[PDB]
Design an enzyme around this catalytic site. Sequence first.
Site: not given
Ligand SMILES: CC(C)(COP(=O)(O)OP(=O)(O)OC[C@H]1O[C@@H](n2cnc3c(N)ncnc32)[C@H](O)[C@@H]1OP(=O)(O)O)[C@@H](O)C(=O)NCCC(=O)NCCSC(=O)CCC(=O)O
Ligand SMILES: CC(C)(COP(=O)(O)OP(=O)(O)OC[C@H]1O[C@@H](n2cnc3c(N)ncnc32)[C@H](O)[C@@H]1OP(=O)(O)O)[C@@H](O)C(=O)NCCC(=O)NCCSC(=O)CCC(=O)O
Ligand SMILES: O=C(O)CCCCCC(=O)O
Lengths: 274, 274, 274
Positions: B189, B166, B141
């Site tokens: 992501e 990547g 998309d």
């Molecule tokens: C994951 C779903 C599909 C939800 O799953 P279901 O509908 O089958 O389940 P549900 O019965 O509704 O949810 C079951 C449990 O999950 C929770 N739940 C479900 N989805 C949730 C969400 N997004 N946030 C929080 N809770 C969520 C419910 O609250 C519920 O709680 P309990 O179980 O506790 O009661 C939805 O949330 C979702 O992610 N939809 C994706 C929409 C999307 O990203 N579309 C693309 C748009 S982009 C596009 O088309 C073009 C525009 C653009 O480019 O941006």
């Molecule tokens: C921030 C880090 C680097 C995590 O830090 P570290 O690995 O050094 O620490 P850690 O020991 O693993 O985490 C320490 C504490 O932080 C929490 N923690 C760390 N990262 C977390 C996260 N993302 N979500 C939730 N908790 C997180 C741990 O659970 C832990 O809990 P406790 O301390 O309580 O135990 C990671 O989460 C992160 O953000 N990575 C970035 C990836 C990213 O964005 N890449 C770019 C992709 S984009 C790309 O490359 C191209 C594709 C594209 O364009 O999309």
């Molecule tokens: O230098 C480039 O042309 C590519 C960089 C890519 C950065 C994200 C990835 O790892 O895919």
Amino acid sequence: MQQLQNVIESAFERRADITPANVDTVTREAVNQVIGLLDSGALRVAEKIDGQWVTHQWLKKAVLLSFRINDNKVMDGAETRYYDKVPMKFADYDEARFQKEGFRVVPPATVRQGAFIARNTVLMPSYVNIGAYVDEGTMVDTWATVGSCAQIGKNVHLSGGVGIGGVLEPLQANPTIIEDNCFIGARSEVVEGVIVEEGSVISMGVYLGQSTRIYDRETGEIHYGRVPAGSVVVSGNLPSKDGSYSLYCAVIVKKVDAKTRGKVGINELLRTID
Amino acid sequence: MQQLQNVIESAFERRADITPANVDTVTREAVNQVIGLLDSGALRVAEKIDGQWVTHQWLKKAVLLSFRINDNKVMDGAETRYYDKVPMKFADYDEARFQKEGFRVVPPATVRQGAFIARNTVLMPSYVNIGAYVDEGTMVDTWATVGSCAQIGKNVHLSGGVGIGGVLEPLQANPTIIEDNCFIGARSEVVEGVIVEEGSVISMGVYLGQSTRIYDRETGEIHYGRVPAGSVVVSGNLPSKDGSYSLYCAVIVKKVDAKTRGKVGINELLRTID
Amino acid sequence: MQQLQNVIESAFERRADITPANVDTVTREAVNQVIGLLDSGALRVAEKIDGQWVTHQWLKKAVLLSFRINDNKVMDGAETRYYDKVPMKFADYDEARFQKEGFRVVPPATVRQGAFIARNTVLMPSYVNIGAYVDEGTMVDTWATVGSCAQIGKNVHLSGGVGIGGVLEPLQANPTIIEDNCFIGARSEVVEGVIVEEGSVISMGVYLGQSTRIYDRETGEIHYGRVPAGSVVVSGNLPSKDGSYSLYCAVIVKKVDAKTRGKVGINELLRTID
Ligand SMILES: CC(C)(COP(=O)(O)OP(=O)(O)OC[C@H]1O[C@@H](n2cnc3c(N)ncnc32)[C@H](O)[C@@H]1OP(=O)(O)O)[C@@H](O)C(=O)NCCC(=O)NCCSC(=O)CCC(=O)O
Ligand SMILES: CC(C)(COP(=O)(O)OP(=O)(O)OC[C@H]1O[C@@H](n2cnc3c(N)ncnc32)[C@H](O)[C@@H]1OP(=O)(O)O)[C@@H](O)C(=O)NCCC(=O)NCCSC(=O)CCC(=O)O
Ligand SMILES: O=C(O)CCCCCC(=O)O
Ligand SMILES: CC(C)(COP(=O)(O)OP(=O)(O)OC[C@H]1O[C@@H](n2cnc3c(N)ncnc32)[C@H](O)[C@@H]1OP(=O)(O)O)[C@@H](O)C(=O)NCCC(=O)NCCSC(=O)CCC(=O)O
Ligand SMILES: O=C(O)CCCCCC(=O)O
Ligand SMILES: O=C(O)CCCCCC(=O)O
């Protein structure tokens, strides 16, 4: 530069009454000069002095005025067409120029004139708005956005879909600033003049504005507006008094380390070959 | 293919000393051959074997080396210009070719050479980086990103603003993989070699890296690195020991069903007409 | 318009059997007429009547059918090439036309034919899909997406990386609608026919679909599918019965005010100069 600064804060005053037709070549030529300075890093919307970042409000003014003084012109896309008033930075460049300027521009990456791109940078397909500054060794990943006047340090990694707040719409007092050696995680957003101190690591899906509580689980100290140098930040939530619900916040989970460093490093091989 | 694999792990060794000028046509021609294989799906950075995904580290190496062996050249945009070293995949294609290749490319969708695009796919305006593989019937998309070497299965829906990590910057061990029939919600992501098992549904604004706890409210079991086949995942938070705050996590709220299926289905009418 | 509405719901019936070759110029010419109406705001997929939004399901049908009746043709990009069946809206325009139409189009902003762009709008580089409607004074910030058939009100601010759900894939019953004077925060997503009532403010990183609980900390009332006019919404989480974990939700923290207004205002200087 008084000779410019003067003619600029003069017109800003009459901002709503100037137009592409009623404007005097005097004010026109200046704004045009002030924009060209910014385009070359010779001038810059904000700078650090005595360990404090300072905004040159009057340069922001010139940026605003470029929009009142210039007129839209059609831009010939290939398959489509555009209609806007801010020129493309790289439209006149030839290989010679790119060669000496030393950064890489991946299509369809786009930069507006009046934006500064340093040496050894890499622009994956993204956007750099007018008056912004991107320092050396930085990478702007895919679909990332460097907002109008934003300040980007050296060796910074702005991951994919990352947005850096501008100052145009909505109108802002200060630009957004990312200090050197910072890593910004995928799809994160930093806005409203928030400052990210050097060597900090912001995880994915982290959103920071002036109303965002930046919580330090260690100290219990809550910050607003800035990320203390060397922090690692991730999303979380803080609970309500009645524990009835919880609201988003940015949690400082630790200070950057070897483990962290292994995941967020820059890839020199991707940089300019000397 | 030993005849290539050999010359490749040879140079990788001297990676920091090779350059677009000091490189031997031998190594040049190979890397060029290895890239062309990947461009055609003939070869692929990773594959499943005996129900395990396996990375061909040496093919990742060739991708890295393409950056040392090639030189930037100016690319003529319409209204602007580019300066990069990786060619545009679709630049030589004619209708004949597009006709037989069977996918749709919506402008301004962009693909780098060395990326595999299967039959019957749809690329809304997005990005597919070098060495990636996108299987049949998939839709990418708007503003979505398929990162370098990422593996995308058949019939997958990557919603708008979705990013697939990547392996280039930051440098990664394994590619990111999405198995067949998976649905990825808007602005989500998936990074750092995490694997999403087939038929899974990731909601919107869900971010998965190696440090992300994937929590199963049912079992109480916490996963790291992979989404068990047929799961439905949404964002949540887990609380601290003292209940002082909570941190982000991915919660598995249920197993995919009819209700879920009604919201995430593919639209065949959008696909290629036989 | 019966003369069109009639021939349209006729073919929709045989949707899977019509093709770019077996289709009758009758049905072809119509769908083509119905699309041209939408392109000009003369017709619109949805509208408010008696304070209720109403979907014209049959116009959605024509949009779907445009995909069965037309064939892909190569589009000449500059550095690359495209292969798709929906024409570029702005490809025929000249300055004269842009001049009278009164909006601004920042490259590389892209709009599909069959989408309505009002006067005094600003399209930063973004995407507007077929059958959508964007009213007066609106700004669509960088990398934002206006999904197929979505309805965007007057004076609306869609910040960077914001996504407005479409109805094509995944197939939806109703379009997504944003009423007048709404502000949508950076990287937020609104999908599945959810309605945002006028003058509302959605913060950054907020995701709303039909399964999203919109919680009012004041009333304790939980909404589904719509944001009550004048609300300010931010991300949060609600806890499980056992307090074992918490799940994402949208929390209505307050009603819009002076403080809020200062951060989300439109910048008239950016608009069309009369
Ligand atoms: C994951 C779903 C599909 C939800 O799953 P279901 O509908 O089958 O389940 P549900 O019965 O509704 O949810 C079951 C449990 O999950 C929770 N739940 C479900 N989805 C949730 C969400 N997004 N946030 C929080 N809770 C969520 C419910 O609250 C519920 O709680 P309990 O179980 O506790 O009661 C939805 O949330 C979702 O992610 N939809 C994706 C929409 C999307 O990203 N579309 C693309 C748009 S982009 C596009 O088309 C073009 C525009 C653009 O480019 O941006
Ligand atoms: C921030 C880090 C680097 C995590 O830090 P570290 O690995 O050094 O620490 P850690 O020991 O693993 O985490 C320490 C504490 O932080 C929490 N923690 C760390 N990262 C977390 C996260 N993302 N979500 C939730 N908790 C997180 C741990 O659970 C832990 O809990 P406790 O301390 O309580 O135990 C990671 O989460 C992160 O953000 N990575 C970035 C990836 C990213 O964005 N890449 C770019 C992709 S984009 C790309 O490359 C191209 C594709 C594209 O364009 O999309
Ligand atoms: O230098 C480039 O042309 C590519 C960089 C890519 C950065 C994200 C990835 O790892 O895919
Ligand atoms: C929604 C607002 C405007 C905040 O509303 P206000 O400032 O009027 O209210 P407030 O008094 O500060 O907040 C009232 C209650 O809401 C909470 N609150 C408000 N905003 C919050 C947020 N984002 N996260 C968490 N909590 C938030 C407060 O903590 C407070 O808690 P209590 O009530 O309990 O005490 C802000 O958060 C926001 O969303 N700003 C949008 C910025 C943005 O997206 N700009 C576009 C950048 S994109 C661009 O310009 C170009 C660059 C690019 O393209 O990316
Ligand atoms: O009108 C323009 O051309 C620029 C608008 C920028 C909006 C976001 C910002 O403040 O940077
Ligand atoms: O196939 C196309 O050209 C359009 C697909 C749109 C996908 C998202 C939507 O429903 O708007």
